[PDB]
Amino acid sequence: MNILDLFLKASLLVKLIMLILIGFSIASWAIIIQRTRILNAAAREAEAFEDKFWSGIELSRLYQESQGKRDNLTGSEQIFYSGFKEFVRLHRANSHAPEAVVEGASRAMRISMNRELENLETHIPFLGTVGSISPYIGLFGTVWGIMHAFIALGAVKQATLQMVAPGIAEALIATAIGLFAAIPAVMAYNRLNQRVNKLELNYDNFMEEFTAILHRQAFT
Amino acid sequence: MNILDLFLKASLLVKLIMLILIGFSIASWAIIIQRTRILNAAAREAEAFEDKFWSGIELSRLYQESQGKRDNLTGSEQIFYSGFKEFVRLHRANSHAPEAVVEGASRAMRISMNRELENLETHIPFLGTVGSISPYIGLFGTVWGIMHAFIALGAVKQATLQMVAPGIAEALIATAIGLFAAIPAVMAYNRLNQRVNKLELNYDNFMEEFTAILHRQAFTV
Amino acid sequence: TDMNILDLFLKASLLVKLIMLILIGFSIASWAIIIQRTRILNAAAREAEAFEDKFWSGIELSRLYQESQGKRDNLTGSEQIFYSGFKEFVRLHRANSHAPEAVVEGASRAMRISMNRELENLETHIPFLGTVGSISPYIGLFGTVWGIMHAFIALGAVKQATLQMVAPGIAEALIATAIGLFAAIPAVMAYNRLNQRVNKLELNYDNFMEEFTAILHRQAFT
Amino acid sequence: MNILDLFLKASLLVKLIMLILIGFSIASWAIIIQRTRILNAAAREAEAFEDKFWSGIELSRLYQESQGKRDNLTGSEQIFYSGFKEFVRLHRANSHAPEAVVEGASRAMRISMNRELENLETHIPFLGTVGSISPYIGLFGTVWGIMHAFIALGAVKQATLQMVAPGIAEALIATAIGLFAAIPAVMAYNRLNQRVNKLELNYDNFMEEFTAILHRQAFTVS
Amino acid sequence: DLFLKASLLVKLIMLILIGFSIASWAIIIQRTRILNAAAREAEAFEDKFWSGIELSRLYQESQGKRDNLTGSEQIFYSGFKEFVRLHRANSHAPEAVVEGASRAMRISMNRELENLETHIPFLGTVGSISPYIGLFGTVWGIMHAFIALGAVKQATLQMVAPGIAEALIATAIGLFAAIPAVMAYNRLNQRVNKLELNYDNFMEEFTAILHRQAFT
Amino acid sequence: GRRDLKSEINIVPLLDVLLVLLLIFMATAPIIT
Amino acid sequence: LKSEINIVPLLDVLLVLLLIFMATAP
Amino acid sequence: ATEQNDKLKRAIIISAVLHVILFAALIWSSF
Amino acid sequence: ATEQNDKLKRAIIISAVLHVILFAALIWSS
């Protein structure tokens, strides 16, 4: 009955399928606990930065306050620092037309938004593979296990359920574990993509609303 | 009742799966009640502010009423208060272009609209996952019960109902409770999600109206 | 088949009685909603084209507003959007406190509010067909699993057993899935078709409202 | 003995479910074969008109060439013709304010563009319906077959599962043909909606280009 | 061997699924080679465009490699070619010239994306359909079992065994065709969406510098 | 705005009927013996 | 984009297991 | 005007012949 | 900077021990 006794006697292929699906379960739970902590920090930080930035503090003060901690900067604060740093560089060192410095700052923001956003979605597409292939890899382990059983059984002159059923019970483990490795990845991948899309929308709106201030500041 | 002893004697895996699915069933009902209460209040209260705003009352009078309610604010009133406070702040602080105070008000309205929709769609995404995967959690418990039935049918040269029935009862109960935890979430999720989108369209139209009023106000100077 | 469904309903355990009663009810309610909503969407489709033809007849809108006061407490559909828009337009134009640009969107709010109230009267039971089309087979299956467990519990009272004595208990349990699917199939067909029809009438009302707000705008500035 | 004689021996309900699911499989493949050719022609006609519009010909000359085909216009040409007709009407009517002319032309495009898309998607909601109910119609045939088998198994004293093999066989064929009718319809519903959304996006993008042309022309002349 | 003895319908079902297996692997390899080239090419061009070298010099570079023009170079060349065509004709206002040029970017950018994704939609069908072709294969194996088992005094596992063998093998090949296809379809489709956003991002910033060039 | 319609293959009801049918056969195997 | 659980090949396993019980001939 | 109903009937007839060919090929393989 | 990789190694250590004690508790039930 105990799972290890059935695992040790199993064929090499279904035994290898168990190590894959257990490996996906181990890794997907680590990725879920790591990503959900990172997205919680990012959501609270972005919400706190919109309340700071729109408080009416001058961008000279808010920039030099930001600049004091540039080594560990992230989210909307990274987008702001990248934009204003390039805006200052172009408007002070070259003094081109307002649109030429503002598009340069807007490009510098677009780069840092993409760079911050792919740092949120680092290992999320792995969960999208685990949630989609894990039940099929489990079912392939089960179909192989049932065939194997019948291959061992087929030498018998008159078969009966009692001698094939232990082989079917051993083979259903790969379907059960193929689902157990899938459920948590399915729940998480669908939810973490909503949370990243909500942050993408927040950063994108911050870029446009800050670009309007750089546009007006340079025009004046 | 003996039913509790039969439950205690079930496989450890099925005891965990029953706690997960009964936990999802209870959480699903708690969410459906709580979100129905909140969305009823928010739909009624928003409508009861739109008429007040469009009553022909002057907006500075409406704002100084809203200043008396500053901790209780929600919905269209929180969007209005956020827009008008930022409009007054910018239009008072310096000689700004009228587009700049209109953009600033439009932003302060966007921020408070999004922040209020997060207070409405709080546990609706989770309710959607319960309605989606609850039958597949039941299916996993069903395959575990089937496996415990086959390993019993394999054990002795003639099996008996008392030996196989533990695996069958675990599989049937895991099927039934997997459906029972899905049903409330499957009926309520699409309904609640449409009610949040109904209020999103109410707030977006209130923002478009109030933005045009503030633009028409600012260009008088 | 040829087994008595009333005898089955009398024999079955209390929860299978409630599941059969709920699903048979859903089916009756589903057909009652489909018949009623088909007549209402037919009437609303005729009203929309009939009033749009009256509106573009070239008759003066103040005369249509006089005709509408001849049925004030009986307004429906497109004519209700017109009457409520023109009412608010007259009310605001009287208070010269509003520039013409500040009358037209105020009147267009009264139109959008009225269009919303009319769509709530067209759509009223449509989101019930959406639940009958989606939970009904799961309620039927929860009934069966319960009926199958009840059959084996009733069997297990005696150790001497035969497939001949439990087989009718299986057939009596499967009726809950058969009814649960029979209630679901019409509800899915009609929920899709009635949403398609409601979505067309929303588009006619939206197009009418943009056409009429332009008439109010040029008339206010003239 | 064979699938032909099994279908001939099968209960009248299984025959009826067979004819319904064949009828939906016939109709859904006919709709797929028609709609894929309609969308191929419409997507090509849009690209083949828009290149001409951007060839640098005067819009007045393009409109005069289009007037000669008023009875046959479709797609981006019908959107253009509706826009230019209402523009050249509204512009001349009062020597009118350019915003009010250009809004009226953009609205004449929008209503003509929505009126064109309902000619492209005309049968697509039936594929979404067939793909939704066909699993349930097959499953109803399955459950009714299993019920009739288990009732018959309850009538005979020497009951054994060998007595119900043909009853389960027709029940399994009824679900298999259910998924056969469902799968092409669900894949085609998703695919044809993606194509209509891609083509709606192309028409919407053309209305913005033409609105900018009309706004720049109207503010130059009025 | 089993494939020689199996029914004619099962021969076709197994050849269709083996065909979908080898075709889906060939597509996964080839699309990966193409999208690797397109991603490396794009980021190498963006660094050239933002180098501060003037756009007329990049146009003269593009005029030399007109044949092998793909990706951001093929968007740039189409836009700048149309801009020069209309501006040298001088028939229109500068805000109209850049509107026509920006369309000649968008047409060329669609023409590139429709060339990158060219076989990816097929993997979506192979990953969706291979399970149901397996399901049809098993139903035909189960038919070969039930037509025998319903026509004897007492059945045995021995007499149905070839129906089980044909069924399970058709499912195993159905899964083996499905797994690479459903795995790689979402991976490849997400790389196309990354390049679509990268080209759309370029098309706006290039439209903006043309708008300033035209008013200049 | 616009509505939407329920297009997807819900396989769960079919899967549960086949599981219930397998469980009936499996429970009745020692009854038929 | 979404990703649901796909288990369609489990029908194939259940139909084989169902046939195995049918073949036992008690 | 009417050409769309002609092309619809042509598609119905083609699809019906394709089903008759498919179900003939399945029934032929049943022997 | 790079500490998110050490947080990932910590996350693998906790998911691995949680699965080892789950499969041990499951085996210990029989």
Residue numbers in the entry:
A (entry chain C): 4 to 223
B (entry chain B): 4 to 224
C (entry chain A): 2 to 223
D (entry chain E): 4 to 225
E (entry chain D): 8 to 223
F (entry chain Y): 8 to 40
G (entry chain Z): 12 to 37
H (entry chain G): 4 to 34
Text taken from the publication that reported this structure:
Both systems rely on the proton gradient at the inner membrane to produce force and movement that are transmitted to target proteins associated with the outer membrane. Ton is involved in the uptake of essential nutrients such as siderophore-iron, vitamin B12 and carbohydrates, while Tol maintains outer membrane integrity and plays an active role in cell division. We have solved the high-resolution structures of the E. coli TonB-ExbB-ExbD and TolA-TolQ-TolR complexes, revealing the inner membrane embedded engine parts of the Ton and Tol systems, and showing how TonB and TolA interact with the ExbBD and TolQR subcomplexes.
We hypothesized that the elongated periplasmic domain of TolA was the main source of heterogeneity, and we engineered a construct with a TEV proteolysis site between Ile50 and Asp51. The stoichiometry of the TolATEVQR complex is two TolA, five TolQ and two TolR. TolAQR is a pentamer of TolQ, a dimer of TolR inside the TolQ pentamer, and two TM of TolA binding at the periphery of the pentamer. The structure reveals most of the TolQ subunit (residues 2-225), the N-terminus and TM of TolR (8-40) and the TM of TolA (4-34). The periplasmic domains of both TolA and TolR were not visible, suggesting these regions are flexible. The highly conserved and essential TolA His2221 makes multiple contacts with TolQ Ser28, Trp32 and Ile29. The two structures of TolAQR described in this report show that TolQ can adopt different conformations, with a high degree of flexibility between the cytoplasmic and TM domains.
